[PDB]
Amino acid sequence: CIYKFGTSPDSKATVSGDHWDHGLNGENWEGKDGAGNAWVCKTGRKQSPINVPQYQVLDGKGSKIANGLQTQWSYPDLMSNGTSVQVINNGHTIQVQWTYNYAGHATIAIPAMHNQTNRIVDVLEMRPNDAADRVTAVPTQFHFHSTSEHLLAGKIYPLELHIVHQVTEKLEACKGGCFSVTGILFQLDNGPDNELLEPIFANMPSREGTFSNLPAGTTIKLGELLPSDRDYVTYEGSLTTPPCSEGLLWHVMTQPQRISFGQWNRYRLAVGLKECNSTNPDAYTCKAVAFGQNFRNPQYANGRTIKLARYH
Amino acid sequence: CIYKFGTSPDSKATVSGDHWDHGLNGENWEGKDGAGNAWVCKTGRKQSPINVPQYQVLDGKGSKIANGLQTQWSYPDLMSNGTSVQVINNGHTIQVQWTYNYAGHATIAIPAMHNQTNRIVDVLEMRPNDAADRVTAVPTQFHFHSTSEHLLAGKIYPLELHIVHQVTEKLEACKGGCFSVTGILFQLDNGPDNELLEPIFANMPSREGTFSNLPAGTTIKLGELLPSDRDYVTYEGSLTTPPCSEGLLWHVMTQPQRISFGQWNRYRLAVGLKECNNPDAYTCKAVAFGQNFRNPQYANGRTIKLARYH
Numbered sequence: 001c002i003y004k005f006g007t008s009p010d011s012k013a014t015v016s017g018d019h020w021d022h023g024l025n026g027e028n029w030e031g032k033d034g035a036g037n038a039w040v041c042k043t044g045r046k047q048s049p050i051n052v053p054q055y056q057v058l059d060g061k062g063s064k065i066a067n068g069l070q071t072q073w074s075y076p077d078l079m080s081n082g083t084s085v086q087v088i089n090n091g092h093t094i095q096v097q098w099t100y101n102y103a104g105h106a107t108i109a110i111p112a113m114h115n116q117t118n119r120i121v122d123v124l125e126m127r128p129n130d131a132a133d134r135v136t137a138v139p140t141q142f143h144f145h146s147t148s149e150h151l152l153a154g155k156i157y158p159l160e161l162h163i164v165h166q167v168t169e170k171l172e173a174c175k176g177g178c179f180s181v182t183g184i185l186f187q188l189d190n191g192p193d194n195e196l197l198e199p200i201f202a203n204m205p206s207r208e209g210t211f212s213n214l215p216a217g218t219t220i221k222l223g224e225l226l227p228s229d230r231d232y233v234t235y236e237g238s239l240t241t242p243p244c245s246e247g248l249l250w251h252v253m254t255q256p257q258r259i260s261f262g263q264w265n266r267y268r269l270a271v272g273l274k275e276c277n278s279t280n281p282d283a284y285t286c287k288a289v290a291f292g293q294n295f296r297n298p299q300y301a302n303g304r305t306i307k308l309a310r311y312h
Numbered sequence: 313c314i315y316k317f318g319t320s321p322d323s324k325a326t327v328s329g330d331h332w333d334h335g336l337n338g339e340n341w342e343g344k345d346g347a348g349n350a351w352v353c354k355t356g357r358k359q360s361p362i363n364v365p366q367y368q369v370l371d372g373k374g375s376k377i378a379n380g381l382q383t384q385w386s387y388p389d390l391m392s393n394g395t396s397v398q399v400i401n402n403g404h405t406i407q408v409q410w411t412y413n414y415a416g417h418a419t420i421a422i423p424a425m426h427n428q429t430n431r432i433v434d435v436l437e438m439r440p441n442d443a444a445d446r447v448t449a450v451p452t453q454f455h456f457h458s459t460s461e462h463l464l465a466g467k468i469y470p471l472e473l474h475i476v477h478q479v480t481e482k483l484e485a486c487k488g489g490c491f492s493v494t495g496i497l498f499q500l501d502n503g504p505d506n507e508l509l510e511p512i513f514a515n516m517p518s519r520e521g522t523f524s525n526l527p528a529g530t531t532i533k534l535g536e537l538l539p540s541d542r543d544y545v546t547y548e549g550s551l552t553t554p555p556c557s558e559g560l561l562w563h564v565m566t567q568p569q570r571i572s573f574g575q576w577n578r579y580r581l582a583v584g585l586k587e588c589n590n591p592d593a594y595t596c597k598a599v600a601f602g603q604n605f606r607n608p609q610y611a612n613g614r615t616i617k618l619a620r621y622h
């Protein structure tokens with residue numbers, strides 16, 4: 001009457017560690033996970049998201065990622081057989097997961113010669129002619145934020161989609177998994193719904209802490225949600241939710257995709273604020289009554305390397 | 313349990329007509345004013361704000377407003393004597409008003425020959441070589457929205473500032489009052505606080521329905537808040553709060569100003585969601601960042617034009 005997204009008394013979510021939500025867009029994120037490890041949201045100096053600069057980055061005038069060192073994305077359609085793809089509302093995002101061996105991947109450039117001192121972010125500092133190898137980054141889930149977490153030169157987008165990947169191969173430091181994220185931005189559009197978003201949006205649960213299996217035959221065209229013009233900005237950053245772990249390689253696609261007025265409303269209602277009447281999560285009746293948001297405030301670069309990659 | 317901005321139990325605001333708030337960014341704005349007239353928020357086809365198009369508008373490829381027909385803005389500093397400039401929290405925005413004779417104005421082109429059929433929005437359809445007069449647009453107040461009400465080619469800005477003007481002269485139709493708004497956008501910036509906003513932000517009240525006098529000597533540099541590069545998009549639109557009355561001439565300045573990370577937070581907490589434990593019978597504090605914007609509205613075939621400054 002009303003409850004922030006992530007705090008609804010009808011939530012069936014389970015929480016390991018301290019409670020958190022997006023009420024102050026992460027300004028109050030100090031706490032511990034289920035294991036007692038302190039979050040680094042407020043203490044790290046390589047936090048995400050960032051306000052991507054115009055100067056020497058988006059203006060095209062800085063050191064760019066050499067064509068041969070660019071990340072490459074290969075996403076086929078994600079397909080449900082009726083139980084093999086799920087849409088989840090975890091009280092922090094709308095997230096897609098899958099329980100079959102989906103073959104989407106990206107490959108990321110690494111130094112050809114590497115050892116324990118190398119990290120997934122090393123491409124940021126490679127010279128264009130450095131001997132390079134490639135590692136496979138496997139998507140683990142994708143999820144959403146409104147409004148966008150990244151800004152481009154001070155501008156906000158209605159929606160951002162994050163595809164989270166794990167790398168376990170080749171780099172000695174990655175045996176236990178290193179991470180990389182690709183972010184896609186959506187600008188508001190005056191046309192019909194972006195049909196590529198509908199397999200998610202038409203199926204997303206509104207109740208916190210629940211999931212829905214996508215109906216058999218549901219197709220998510222992840223390779224089409226990804227921009228065809230694959231310009232991106234890349235930098236070392238963090239998870240944008242507690243515990244905000246650092247060392248992630250970020251790609252932010254700079255060519256925004258489209259989202260309709262109504263789709264933006266539907267998404268924000270799914271992460272909305274709820275009014276609840278009592279009569280144990282089942283002892284409440286809740287309805288979304290206000291459009292919500294689930295984004296983290298932008299973080300300072302603090303001198304980090306941030307580079308543009310021009311596609312072809 | 314928190315309260316939407318505009319619904320706080322400690323609010324001292326008064327309301328004539330139906331209550332409303334920005335909870336659904338205006339989707340649910342069906343209602344009647346104090347005189348029983350229906351709001352037109354959900355029924356009009358000249359509603360504001362709009363998502364300003366790239367195609368034949370921001371690309372500069374469309375029909376542009378001729379230099380001679382461009383709106384011109386003349387804003388000197390606003391200056392408080394301790395009681396003469398106020399910052400108001402009305403439960404719907406943070407608004408600046410003044411109770412002295414401030415000399416800020418704008419001028420808007422109108423056809424030289426005019427009759428009762430003519431309207432303040434006539435400039436939109438004037439030909440570059442048409443005989444023009446000018447009318448004075450007098451600012452009545454200015455106020456803020458986060459995030460921005462206008463989008464530019466599908467992009468949102470953290471803050472928008474609206475300077476509301478009344479025109480009463482020359483146009484027969486403007487007895488008594490036609491209206492025009494100028495909107496200034498602020499893009500997020502990684503630098504220090506924009507000092508131009510501080511006279512307002514340092515003094516804005518957090519309690520809904522209240523105001524605060526700006527300290528004697530406090531200056532608001534309105535003419536510097538306005539971009540110096542005066543490119544704008546212009547169209548016929550509406551109020552962006554109930555009753556959403558139409559017939560307004562809009563100007564949206566296309567060159568954004570800067571707002572710091574910390575200022576954007578401060579503003580959003582001033583329009584924040586409140587937790588509370590007779591308006592004076594309650595103690596409330598802002599606990600979550602808020603917003604006070606209306607959703608974008610379709611153009612519905614309206615004329616939208618770019619004006620290039622000089």
Ligand SMILES: *[C@@H]1O[C@H](CO)[C@@H](O)[C@H](O)[C@H]1NC(C)=O
Nearest residue numbers: 080081082083084099100101
């Ligand atoms: C759907 O896929 C899951 C995971 O691959 C599998 O366990 C299940 O047997 C499948 N059923 C159908 C209908 O193909």
Ligand SMILES: *[C@@H]1O[C@H](CO)[C@@H](O)[C@H](O)[C@H]1NC(C)=O
Nearest residue numbers: 111113114115116117118172
């Ligand atoms: C890691 O590589 C560097 C660079 O060639 C080298 O100097 C160093 O000895 C290597 N250390 C290990 C762990 O082998």
Ligand SMILES: *[C@@H]1O[C@H](CO)[C@@H](O)[C@H](O)[C@H]1NC(C)=O
Nearest residue numbers: 392393394395396411412413
């Ligand atoms: C401040 O200005 C107001 C309105 O112009 C005036 O009524 C008031 O007397 C002034 N107070 C001063 C100069 O102390």
Ligand SMILES: *[C@@H]1O[C@H](CO)[C@@H](O)[C@H](O)[C@H]1NC(C)=O
Nearest residue numbers: 423425426427428429430431
């Ligand atoms: C002015 O009004 C007259 C009489 O109503 C009408 O003939 C004419 O169309 C109007 N002039 C213009 C061009 O607005």
Ligand SMILES: *[C@H]1O[C@@H](CO)[C@@H](O)[C@H](O)[C@H]1NC(C)=O
Nearest residue numbers: 274275276277284285286287
């Ligand atoms: C109780 O809360 C809601 C249930 O989530 C609504 O059904 C209802 O509007 C409310 N009580 C009333 C009548 O205001």
Ligand SMILES: [Zn+2]
Nearest residue numbers: 143145162240
């Ligand atoms: Zn994310």
Ligand SMILES: [Zn+2]
Nearest residue numbers: 455457474552
């Ligand atoms: Zn306004």
